[PDB]
């Protein structure tokens, strides 16, 4: 098998009223390598096809996909908005971002915590979890690392943002 | 260290075909993210 230079863990939160925020997040599994990603992906539903409200969520080195972590806290993330992009795009654009991450395309992977996908009503965001929100070389980097590797639309946005409550 | 296309390569080989476990299926499909008719 072909080995991937971290460990990957992916996350599905389901939106539950009597469960609290964190507690509507499930941990699936983990993989290490190539092949056992994509035995993965190929058995998993697509984002067009969960609830909405829900989350896929793919984090590296058992880092929770939370503010509360001590890898994302000091952290922020690059937040692609999706106005009524079409089931198909949605999809290959959620899993072009996997490839980025087990791939370990950009130069500063390693400030890279994750990727988040939220399906919503109106809205589809995906988003790139950054370790750091002060560096602005890897932020900057792994941004424009994105838009050419994405391939994005001139009328879809690409914005970074911190986790923290601070302007 | 992998490139798209590297990656992409490998998805229908028949190690990357293999199933998830039983237990690793039982949670996927109680999730109800278990990829239909697979």
């Given at each position: 098998?072909?080995?991937?230079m971290?460990?990957?863990?992916?996350?599905?939160?389901?939106?539950?009223?009597?469960?609290?925020?964190?507690?509507?997040?499930?941990?699936?599994?983990?993989?290490?390598?190539?092949?056992?990603?994509?035995?993965?992906?190929?058995?998993?539903?697509?984002?067009?096809?969960?609830?909405?409200?829900?989350?896929?969520?793919?984090?590296?080195?058992?880092?929770?996909?939370?503010?509360?972590?001590?890898?994302?806290?000091?952290?922020?993330?690059?937040?692609?908005?999706?106005?009524?992009?079409?089931?198909?795009?949605?999809?290959?654009?959620?899993?072009?971002?996997?490839?980025?991450?087990?791939g370990?395309?950009?130069?500063?992977?390693?400030?890279?915590?994750?990727?988040?996908?939220?399906?919503?009503?109106?809205?589809?965001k995906?988003?790139?979890?950054?370790?750091?929100?002060?560096?602005?070389?890897?932020?900057?980097?792994?941004?424009?690392?994105?838009?050419?590797?994405?391939?994005?639309?001139?009328?879809?946005?690409?914005?970074?943002?911190?986790?923290?409550?601070?302007? | 260290?992998?490139?798209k296309?590297?990656?992409?390569?490998?998805?229908?080989?028949?190690?990357?075909?293999?199933?998830?476990?039983?237990?690793?299926?039982?949670?996927?499909?109680?999730?109800?993210?278990?990829?239909?008719?697979?």
């Open positions: 098998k072909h080995p991937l971290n460990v990957w863990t992916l996350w599905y939160l389901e939106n539950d009223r009597s469960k609290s925020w964190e507690d509507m997040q499930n941990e699936i599994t983990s993989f290490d390598t190539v092949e056992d990603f994509w035995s993965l992906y190929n058995h998993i539903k697509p984002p067009s096809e969960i609830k909405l409200g829900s989350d896929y969520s793919l984090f590296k080195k058992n880092i929770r996909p939370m503010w509360e972590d001590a890898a994302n806290k000091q952290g922020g993330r690059w937040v692609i908005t999706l106005n009524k992009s079409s089931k198909t795009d949605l999809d290959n654009l959620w899993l072009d971002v996997l490839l980025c991450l087990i370990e395309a950009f130069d500063h992977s390693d400030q890279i915590c994750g990727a988040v996908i939220n399906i919503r009503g109106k809205s589809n995906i988003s790139i979890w950054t370790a750091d929100g002060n560096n602005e070389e890897a932020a900057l980097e792994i941004g424009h690392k994105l838009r050419d590797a994405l391939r994005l639309g001139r009328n879809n946005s690409l914005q970074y943002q911190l986790h923290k409550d601070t302007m | 260290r992998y490139s296309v590297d990656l992409l390569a490998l998805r229908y080989s028949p190690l990357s075909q293999t199933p998830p476990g039983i237990e690793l299926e039982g949670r996927l499909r109680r999730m109800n993210i278990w990829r239909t008719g697979s």
